[PDB]
Structure formats: structure tokens, C-alpha cells
């Protein structure tokens, strides 16, 4: 919470004017140090994401379900038959489920940023700009790939340097990259 100052930050950000991939409304997507996600489809049917390394109920995987009433998180070795679809409609079996969590309940954009560093899992979100932290997970799983279930975009993060600007109220207003010009 800086106040009217310019801070130089070096972390994993999305480079400006980069190559993004556009889809419609399902293969395995690699997870390279975070994946950017965005969707602006009204009455979105795609609700949920899958994280894991083998995704065949042999290693502790991650699964989250989102709706308009709450947001639950279930981390276990969920067994998938051929493909997820959206209730036992996404998995078939479960074994060694010792960890479970739950979050607080509460054109339009819907952005998400995932990150797994130092044995932590945090997610940012914002609805219509800067993204605020939503919930942190102390789980220490080894995420390697990325998979969604149902007009979304996929982007990767890179260790670039940025210059952030804070106003009097303490909110980010503008930012300047350090490359491409």
C-alpha cells in the first residue's frame, strides 16, 4: 500500500503486446509458470478448472467448481474416464482425500491468474484494471499441466520488469513495461 510513488517491481507478469491463443465454446495445455485466463461470455457455461501432473488418479490433483452461490475447492486424486463435463459428472472415483477447503460466498470481463511457487497456490480475479488476490491455498501439489471443463484465452507469464504507479487512495493506475521500445 504505497502512497503517491513509483515502485519498480520484478516478478512474473504478462508481457504487453504478446501472442495469445483464442478458442471457442479440448486438449491438454502445459502450465509454464502460470497461465492467464479470461472470458467475457454472458451466462458462461464453462465453470471449473483441472490441475495435476498425470490426471489418472495416481497423484494428488486439484479441482475447483464455481457457481453463482459459492465457490468450493476439492483437492484429491479424482479419476477421470475420458473427458470432464459439467454430482458425479466430472469424476468417477476418489481415494486418499485428506484435504478440502471452501471459499467465502458472495460487457463484463472475468479474468483469472494462477501461480504455484514456494508450495503455495494463489488466484487473482476481477470483474467489470488491476487484479486483487482472492484466496491462497497452502497445498503443496506438483502441478505440471492445465485443463479446463465446460471463447476463452490462454496466456503465459514471463519474468519481466514493470513500473507501477500508485495514487493517493493506494490503487494501481498505470504501468510501463521495460522492453519492446
Amino acid at each position: 500500500f504505497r502512497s503517491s510513488v513509483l515502485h519498480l517491481t520484478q516478478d512474473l507478469f504478462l508481457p504487453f503486446f504478446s501472442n495469445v491463443t483464442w478458442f471457442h465454446a479440448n486438449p491438454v495445455l502445459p502450465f509454464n509458470d502460470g497461465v492467464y485466463f479470461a472470458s467475457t461470455e454472458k451466462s458462461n457455461i464453462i465453470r471449473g478448472w483441472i490441475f495435476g501432473t498425470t490426471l489418472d488418479s495416481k497423484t494428488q490433483s486439484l479441482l475447483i467448481v464455481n457457481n453463482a452461490t459459492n465457490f468450493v475447492i476439492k483437492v484429491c486424486e479424482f479419476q477421470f474416464c475420458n473427458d470432464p463435463f459439467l454430482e458425479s459428472g466430472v469424476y468417477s472415483s476418489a481415494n486418499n482425500c485428506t484435504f478440502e477447503y471452501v471459499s467465502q460466498p458472495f460487457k463484463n470481463l472475468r479474468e483469472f491468474v494462477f501461480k504455484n511457487i514456494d508450495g503455495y497456490f494463489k488466484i487473482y480475479s476481477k470483474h467489470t484494471s488491476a487484479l486483487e488476490p482472492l484466496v491462497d491455498l497452502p497445498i503443496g501439489i506438483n502441478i505440471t499441466r492445465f485443463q479446463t471443463l465446460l471463447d476463452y484465452y490462454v496466456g503465459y507469464l514471463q519474468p519481466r520488469t514493470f513500473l507501477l504507479k500508485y495514487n493517493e487512495n493506494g490503487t494501481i493506475t498505470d504501468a510501463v513495461d521495460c522492453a519492446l521500445d
Binding site: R2, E132, N169, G170
Partner: protein, 237 residues
């Protein structure tokens, strides 16, 4: 986990629902959040500064004065009443002579409304002296001189009738001493094992010797360019 020391007061900062503490430009903590009440509190460093002693001379008297630089005497009184001050000596405490200046608080002298010539500079245009008032130490505002009004008119002029001869002096330095260093006897000193370790650091001794030699050579030309302006020696009749 955040440890420190200071004074906690209420501020007007409006934090975000996910902020914990605050930092300034020089990256120092100045605001925190209470995990129980969730209020905005600011941190300020506690009072500190230097101490100066004003003395008129050990051959004249043994009375002195204490000056606390950059502090208000309202806090000094509290720090003297309760045993919370670092200097354990409190001799100038039972005195009704306390004055507040722009450079701090002065204890051990009284302020007068008369102006004189500055003798001991204190600061912010305030000087002190030792007058007979029962001799004591007084503080006053320094004066610049005496006011003189020139009678300016449209047809007035002043012409002097006499004169005088004056002699003034002036002292200016010319040169200084000359020194040389070996860098070997000073560092190790009659030691062979230590001398083999100094050879790895390079040629710093050479640079030092060259600088000293240059200074020693310049000290001679300084006098040469001042006292050798003439070529012949003249004698008086």
C-alpha cells in the same frame, strides 16, 4: 512478527481490505493494522537528538548551560520527571529558567529583551554571553549594528577637510609539511611471511608513494612561485 518501537497514533489513511502495513519512499514502516480491531494506526520514531554545552571559561566560572537540539521542552519535562532519558545526569532540572528557541530548548539561562553584539552563537539568530546583570548567563537576539541616517537632499554635498594614515595586517599560509611512507614497515613490520601476502594486492604502495612525492614536489614550487619573483639582490645604502 513485525517488531519495532515508536509512538502509535490515529491517522486518516484509508487502506484496502487486503492490506496489512504501509511503507514510504525510503521503504520504512509507518503504518500497521490491528488484527483485533482493524483500525489505522501510524508509527512515529521516538524523540532523539544531540546535546551541547555552553561554557564561558573554566578560569572565570564553573556554570554551564545545556542545549537539546531539535526537540520541544514539553517532552523534555516528561522525560526528566520519569526516568526515561538516556543521560543519567539531571542537574539543571530544579530551575524556573526554561526558554524555547527555534533550534531547541535552552536550560540554564534567561532570555532578555535587549540586543547586543553576538558573543557565542547558539543558532537561529540567538547568541549568549556572560554579563554582570550577580553574574550569570543571558540569552538575547544578536544585533547587526548601529542605525545611521544620511541627510539626502537635492543640493547637499559633503567634503572632508582632514585625513589619516592607517596600517593593516593580513596572514596567509603558503606551504605545509612533507611526509613519506614506506607501506612495508607500517603494514607488516620486519616480517617475511606477511610480506609475501601483500604482493597479491597490486600496486597501491606505488600510487601512495607517487602521490606523496607529487605533494612534496608541489610544496616547494608553492614557495618558489611566491618568494622568487626577483632575480637580483638589492642592498640598502
Amino acid at each position: 512478527g513485525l517488531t519495532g518501537t515508536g509512538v502509535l497514533t490515529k491517522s486518516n489513511k484509508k487502506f484496502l481490505p487486503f492490506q496489512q502495513f504501509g511503507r514510504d519512499i525510503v521503504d520504512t514502516t509507518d503504518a500497521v493494522r490491528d488484527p483485533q480491531t482493524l483500525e489505522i494506526l501510524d508509527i512515529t520514531p521516538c524523540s532523539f537528538g544531540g546535546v551541547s554545552v555552553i561554557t564561558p571559561g573554566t578560569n572565570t566560572s564553573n556554570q554551564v548551560a545545556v542545549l537539546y537540539q531539535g526537540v520541544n521542552c514539553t517532552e523534555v519535562s516528561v522525560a526528566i520527571h520519569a526516568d526515561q532519558l538516556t543521560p543519567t545526569w539531571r542537574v539543571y532540572s530544579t530551575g524556573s529558567n526554561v526558554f524555547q528557541t527555534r533550534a531547541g530548548c535552552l536550560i540554564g539561562a534567561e532570555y532578555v529583551n535587549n540586543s547586543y553584539e553576538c558573543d557565542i552563537p547558539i543558532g537561529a539568530g540567538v547568541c549568549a554571553s556572560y554579563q554582570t546583570q550577580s553574574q550569570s548567563i543571558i540569552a538575547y537576539t544578536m544585533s547587526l549594528g548601529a542605525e545611521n541616517s544620511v541627510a539626502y537632499s537635492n543640493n547637499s554635498i559633503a567634503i572632508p577637510t582632514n585625513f589619516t594614515i592607517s596600517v593593516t595586517t593580513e596572514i596567509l599560509p603558503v606551504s605545509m609539511t612533507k611526509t613519506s611512507v614506506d607501506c612495508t614497515m607500517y603494514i607488516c613490520g620486519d616480517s617475511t611471511e606477511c610480506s609475501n601476502l601483500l604482493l597479491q594486492y597490486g600496486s597501491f604502495c606505488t600510487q601512495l608513494k607517487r602521490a606523496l612525492t607529487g605533494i612534496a614536489v608541489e610544496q616547494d614550487k608553492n614557495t618558489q612561485e611566491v618568494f622568487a619573483q626577483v632575480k637580483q639582490i638589492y642592498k640598502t645604502p
